[PDB]
From Swiss-Prot, chain A:
Primary role: DNA-dependent RNA polymerase catalyzes the transcription of DNA into RNA using the four ribonucleoside triphosphates as substrates. Second largest component of RNA polymerases II which synthesizes mRNA precursors and many functional non-coding RNAs. Proposed to contribute to the polymerase catalytic activity and forms the polymerase active center together with the largest subunit. Pol II is the central component of the basal RNA polymerase II transcription machinery.
General remark: The binding of ribonucleoside triphosphate to the RNA polymerase II transcribing complex probably involves a two-step mechanism. The initial binding seems to occur at the entry (E) site and involves a magnesium ion coordinated by three conserved aspartate residues of the two largest RNA Pol II subunits. Present with 18700 molecules/cell in log phase SD medium.
Compartments in which it is found: Nucleus
Source organism of this protein record: Saccharomyces cerevisiae (strain ATCC 204508 / S288c) (Baker's yeast)
Assembly with partners or alone: Component of the RNA polymerase II (Pol II) complex consisting of 12 subunits.
Recorded family membership: Belongs to the RNA polymerase beta chain family.
Domain of life: Eukaryota
Entry protein name: DNA-directed RNA polymerase II subunit RPB2
Residues of the full protein shown: 50 to 147 of 1224
From Swiss-Prot, chain B:
Zn finger residue spans: TFIIB-type: 1-32
Portion of the full-length sequence here: 22 to 214 of 345
Misc note: Present with 6750 molecules/cell in log phase SD medium.
Functional description taken from the UniProt entry: General factor that plays a major role in the activation of eukaryotic genes transcribed by RNA polymerase II.
Family (UniProt): Belongs to the TFIIB family.
One GO BP: transcriptional start site selection at RNA polymerase II promoter
Gene source species: Saccharomyces cerevisiae (strain ATCC 204508 / S288c) (Baker's yeast)
The encoding gene: SUA7
Compositionally skewed regions (Basic and acidic residues) per UniProt: 44-57
Name this polypeptide is given: Transcription initiation factor IIB
């Protein structure tokens, strides 16, 4: 069940809503106006590191289960996503 | 407390918790009969209860040092709730939000909270940065120092104490740091006791 979630499920969740856009259309008066824009934030591939710990002093290293139990830490691994930020523009459709 | 019966300068008095008394070890006289379990008493304010089932959980903790004396209760959707009233009552709370210039400067804490989570910094660091800032922000010693760099300087002041290692260059990139400015602001605050 957990494996299915990691290998597949996790990505499909990052792709359902995924992309979020914000459009800043002008008043169309005259310069600085008559500039319509639309900005994109896109979610690509999801990466999952093997388990690690980020110590007080900078240093992030591999965390093993015994260490986790003994130092009361969470046996967690990092989630990484390829994010792309696209920008578009039109005057007073394209 | 101190034993009336004897009275030798250092009062050697014992807390016989299991027997529920405060006793004078020297003479044997019980000085108090009423005794409370502090740890179990504290568990009525801070607890496992998030549900609101616990008849023991009757209070709530607060941080005077940072929150000050602001006791507030969310108006929220319960089991039976017409959304109309929740909106109405919360709309009403909005008009009643006419808070001071410093009761609106608690939004500078909301900034540090957003800056620490972004810096992958612990809860203790925030509570230290929010502390050092709350003490120096109004200061004449600081005066018209770059407000953006004053709160970034308190993040290093918080990190230095909580032993959480962070470089000046790290915090510099985290917000935007004018090196000489955020080095001067980090010294007036460091001088502020
Ligand atoms: Zn005595």
């Amino acid at each position: 069940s957990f494996n299915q979630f990691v290998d597949y499920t996790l990505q499909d969740i990052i792709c359902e809503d995924s992309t979020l856009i914000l459009e800043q259309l002008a008043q169309h008066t005259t310069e600085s106006d008559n500039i319509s824009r639309k900005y994109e934030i896109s979610f690509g591939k999801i990466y999952v590191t093997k388990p690690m710990v980020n110590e007080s002093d900078g240093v992030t290293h591999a965390l093993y289960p015994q260490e986790a139990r003994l130092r009361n830490l969470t046996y967690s691994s990092g989630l990484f996503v390829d994010v792309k930020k696209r920008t578009y523009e039109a005057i007073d459709e394209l | 407390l101190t034993c009336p019966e004897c009275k030798v300068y250092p009062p050697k008095i014992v807390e016989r918790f299991s027997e529920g008394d405060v006793v004078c070890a020297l003479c044997g006289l019980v000085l108090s009969d009423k005794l409370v379990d502090t740890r179990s008493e504290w568990r009525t304010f801070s607890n496992d209860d998030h549900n609101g089932d616990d008849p023991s959980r009757v209070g709530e903790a607060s941080n005077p040092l940072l929150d000050g004396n602001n006791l507030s209760t969310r108006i929220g959707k319960g089991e039976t709730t017409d959304m109309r009233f929740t909106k109405e009552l919360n709309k009403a709370q909005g008009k009643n939000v006419m808070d001071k210039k410093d009761n609106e400067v608690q939004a500078a804490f909301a900034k540090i909270t957003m800056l620490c989570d972004a810096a992958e910094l612990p809860k203790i660091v925030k509570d230290c940065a929010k502390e050092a800032y709350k003490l120096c922000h109004d200061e004449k010693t600081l005066k018209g120092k770059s407000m953006e760099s004053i709160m970034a300087a308190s993040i290093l002041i918080g990190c230095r104490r909580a032993e959480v290692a962070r470089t000046f260059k790290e915090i510099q990139s985290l917000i935007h740091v004018k090196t000489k400015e955020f080095g001067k602001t980090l010294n007036i605050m460091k001088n502020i006791l």
